[PDB]
């Protein structure tokens, strides 16, 4: 009656292997923004595994805006790995 040493996890990464993230002194990192956005907005009808797919979509389209530098008009790409075995819905609230 046992299970694998590791399982039922799901990790989201702000950037791919080798690349860097994007922090902004006033808005923060894109990953966190995208995260807070998609989660608050869709946690109600979208499962963590699919919301991260959303965050991916957002992060993929975003371009860097910081003129005069070399960070201007740059890209970034998020990723996530999963060993989850069933949809993971956060069922926010659920009225008493």
């Amino acid at each position: 009656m046992r299970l694998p040493t590791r399982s039922d996890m799901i990790c989201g990464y702000a950037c791919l292997k080798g690349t860097a993230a994007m922090r902004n002194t006033k808005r923060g990192s894109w990953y966190i923004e995208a995260l807070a956005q998609v989660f608050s907005e869709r946690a109600c009808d979208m499962h963590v595994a699919d919301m991260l797919v959303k965050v991916n979509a957002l992060i993929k389209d975003r371009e860097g805006y910081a003129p005069g530098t070399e960070f201007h008009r740059c890209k970034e790409m998020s990723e996530y790995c999963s060993t989850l075995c069933r949809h993971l819905y956060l069922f926010p609230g659920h009225p008493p």
């Binding site: 799901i10 966190i32 109600c44």
Partner: protein
Amino acid sequence: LCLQVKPCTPEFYQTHFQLAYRLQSRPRGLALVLSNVHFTGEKELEFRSGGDVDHSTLVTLFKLLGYDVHVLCDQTAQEMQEKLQNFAQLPAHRVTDSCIVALLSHGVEGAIYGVDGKLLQLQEVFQLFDNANCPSLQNKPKMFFIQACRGDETDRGVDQQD
């Protein structure tokens, strides 16, 4: 900047808990938001500017999602593995249905830097919550949010043409 967690119509739940991870406990699980911003050691690492907004944005978010959230700031590699293992053991997990952990700091492929300047292998992090080292969380979804750098280089991108 004011997060709005929309709730789900009970109809949804009755049509989805049937085939998902049981996750209606209160709290909905524990959340840890360890974030290193002020780095000492051989201060080669910049200053996680805006690292405070990220930290807040997440703390709030995880709080409105219904998570008894904890926090740690400017920690050393060793302190992290040490305090992370504690967070992993905390007897509360037995009653909750899931667990969240956000690690935000500087880093490299596979690991994150502590204010200490030393590294902590992310693989070591996960291990602490597996089915062996953390039996109080078996079969319960465990999300991780790694806000770090897997590198030095900046992605320039490439023209998408049809």
